[PDB]
Design a protein around this nucleic acid. Structure first.
Lengths: 95, 97, 82, 106, 97, 109, 82, 98
DNA sequence: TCGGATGTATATATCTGACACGTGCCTGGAGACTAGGGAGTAATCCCCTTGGCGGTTAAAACGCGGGGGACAGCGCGTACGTGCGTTTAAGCGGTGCTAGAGCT
DNA sequence: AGCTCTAGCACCGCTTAAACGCACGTACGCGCTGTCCCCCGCGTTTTAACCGCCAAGGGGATTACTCCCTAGTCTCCAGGCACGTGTCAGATATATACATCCGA
């Protein structure tokens, strides 16, 4: 289809939560969208390897959590894992 | 008349080009080089305007990064003038040569 | 047929790149060495880019084709598509 | 009433889109419901980190619009984002201002 | 209990060895390396063939994807020979049942 | 029923087209795998196997050895400019390194 | 329990590695620099290997875990399976 | 007086011997303890397969040998025969490891 | 030392095209329900990792002489930087087309 | 296979500032030298790596069984994405502070 899907709106919403007074150029937004897609591909890519290495058939939070710990550096991983686990905890508990 | 000593303007140019984001290579000459190379792989190829810019952005970033590695090895030889052996060593230690 | 376009990259252009790279003084031979290095780099990137274009049976090299070539060569470029 | 999975998790990034991409990307035969929620949170967190450092760089340059320069500065100044994006080139990002002490005048 | 069958290219690597050097043998360590090499090259070509199919939003990996992955991953003349060998195998195979 | 004949034998290949086909599916590289894909891939893998084994066998004879060992594989992969590029990021266990000394280190008269 | 084992890698062992690397003369300061470099290398590889072991809920680090860690680290090791 | 080889003569002989052979240069036991020591900081009471320790050693020795080659080149580039810590630091910096 | 030249920094004002905001709408996410087998549990086994003893014997550590190379200091020249007049062609605006990317 | 109509290609004309050739000085390449130190090669001392055999126990691999979780399917609807919009952020233009460099 003609319609192109991009994380623009979501990146913008995060920007508003971080710096509501600050805007973002279309060029900077293109970089951010490509950045999100690259990091997404890395985590999903490593998550697939983890499942295959264990001959598993489904990607779970453990694979994502492990991929994050492998791909992201020390502090980013620890902080990202806290955010990820919190989001999964709230999602399942809120129901 | 007044004249700046050797390297005085070079240091100013370094600050200028590090503070500036624009492409340092002329767009049209670089585009012709891309065309000259592409025609060897396949005749009558076409390039999107964004594709030519993408090649230039990567090429300039690659060369700038290489010059930094080159400058570091030049300094290691206690020299300030970069020489072809510096580029060769950088590329060799980087594993691309 | 385009030919001898490598010499089209002006001497100051190589200087500007070196200046951005922090090079204070540039030997007169760096210009030919830099042209040769860029020639090899572009040949490698264009070869893969054209290969993606040919595989897609297209005649126009798309910007995504260059990004994929750069991505394969471990030099992923952000800003030209996902 | 339908409530998007992102709002349930308290996230902005679309859990639905992440779930669709995980399934359509053929990363595995199956995709647990927890995977897109966890992944969306990680992507949203890393997005906030980049935007925060980029926004600070924008404010430091007395600018209120993030441009590629601010993104490059943020990525290279952070000791960890530079490690994650060490192999990454940013369009129009330029380079960090840096001159070796050996080059400065006596 | 009995050990679970683990597949390996050992006998196939050996048959190829008998063709290039009928008198030459190969140690278990060298065979393990050759098996690792075959598996790694397999994953690399298959991995690139996957990306190619996804980039063109194709659902099926065909000889076109494999041929292109080979041209991308294998350097210089190795690609030409590999493409020729792959083409010869597929063309002759198509003549069979 | 016709006599079962392996796809490898039909293609004139030693490498198992069936195994390559199974692995292409089990690895989830794509939703579908064309019957021509494993034949082409098996031929490429068989060719590259022959290329290294040919050079490795030559290195073995040059060392007066009849069995290929990791040393012969490393010497072959590193002496060939193209194999060294394909396996530049690859480390071979017990393979060692090429016997090369920088000329500047050698004594002078 | 285990401690200071980094100093257990003898000075000749580093020399032998340097000799294989073709180094004809080795300054005495290289030994401490080499140990530090090796320590961070092992830390990066072991961290990833242990991460695979933990994900598999296993208690023993297997050769596959090491190969996958190395493979992810960008250097592939042939001869240990995979 | 006893016979003595000139400085660097035995070094060249050592280079040839170690470049000709494929034997591992680090002692297995000291390296094995070092591996578990580093591992002990990530998870207590871990176990290591015998082949896992060997795999780490093969990679570690190959990495250091390759680094020493890059280190020798930058030392030679500075017109020096003796490698110095700045040579390793530069090689690693140019390799993008720092 | 040091004062003069003088590039960069900063404040003000005009402008504008870019992005911040609104809209229509439609498609793909959300809700609902199912099958069914992947994942999880439990019980078992056994093999291979951890640990110890013994001893030896090769390898490591230690001291030393000394030599050759690390490199501080110097010469000096020619190479590279700075400056200028020249002029080149890159960049821009505009017009023509139509191959061929995109979609059905 | 067919249609569309995008935008890549080609060309002209003008601008002007980047590119160039050249003048010419001294910054810096590096050949040469002194030297002293620290690294080498060797003998000696010694220590803990290695071999080898035995323990044992745990955790990895396996089987059996289960079930609850995900993929498929369906409905639904308002979230998100092209289109529309405009106003105000930073480019452009000007004024003008203030540090640094060089020649004396």
């Amino acid at each position: 289809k003609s319609r192109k899907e991009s994380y623009a709106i979501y990146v913008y919403k995060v920007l508003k939560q971080v710096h509501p007074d600050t805007g973002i150029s279309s060029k900077a937004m293109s970089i951010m969208n490509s950045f999100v897609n690259d990091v997404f591909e890395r985590i999903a890519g490593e998550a697939s390897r983890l499942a295959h290495y264990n001959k598993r058939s489904t990607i779970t939070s453990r694979e994502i959590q492990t991929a994050v710990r492998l791909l992201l550096p020390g502090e980013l991983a620890k902080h990202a894992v806290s955010e990820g686990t919190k989001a999964v905890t709230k999602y399942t508990s809120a129901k | 008349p007044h004249r700046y000593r050797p390297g005085t303007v070079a240091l100013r140019e370094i600050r200028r080009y590090q503070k500036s984001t624009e492409l340092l290579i002329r767009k049209l000459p670089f585009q012709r080089l891309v065309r000259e190379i592409a025609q060897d792989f396949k005749t009558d190829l076409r390039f999107q305007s964004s594709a030519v810019m993408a090649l230039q952005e990567a090429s300039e970033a690659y060369l700038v990064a290489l010059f930094e590695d080159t400058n570091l090895c030049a300094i290691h030889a206690k020299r300030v003038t970069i020489m072809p052996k510096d580029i060769q060593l950088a590329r060799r230690i980087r594993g691309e040569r | 047929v385009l030919r001898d376009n490598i010499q089209g990259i002006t001497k100051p252009a190589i200087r500007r790149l070196a200046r951005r790279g922090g090079v204070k003084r540039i030997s007169g031979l760096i210009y030919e060495e830099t042209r040769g290095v860029l020639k090899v780099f572009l040949e490698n990137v264009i070869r893969d880019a054209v290969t993606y274009t040919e595989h897609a049976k297209r005649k126009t090299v798309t910007a995504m084709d260059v990004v994929y070539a750069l991505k394969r060569q471990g030099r992923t470029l952000y800003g030209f598509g996902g | 009433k339908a409530k998007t999975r992102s709002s349930r998790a308290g996230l902005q990034f679309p859990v639905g889109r992440v779930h669709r991409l995980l399934r359509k990307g053929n990363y595995a035969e199956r995709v647990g419901a927890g995977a897109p929620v966890y992944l969306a949170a990680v992507l949203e967190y890393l997005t906030a980190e980049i935007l925060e450092l980029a926004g600070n760089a924008a404010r430091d340059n007395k600018k209120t619009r993030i441009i590629p320069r601010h993104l490059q500065l943020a990525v290279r100044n952070d000791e960890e984002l530079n490690k994650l994006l060490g192999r990454v080139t940013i369009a129009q990002g330029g380079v960090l201002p840096n001159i070796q002490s050996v080059l400065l005048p006596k």
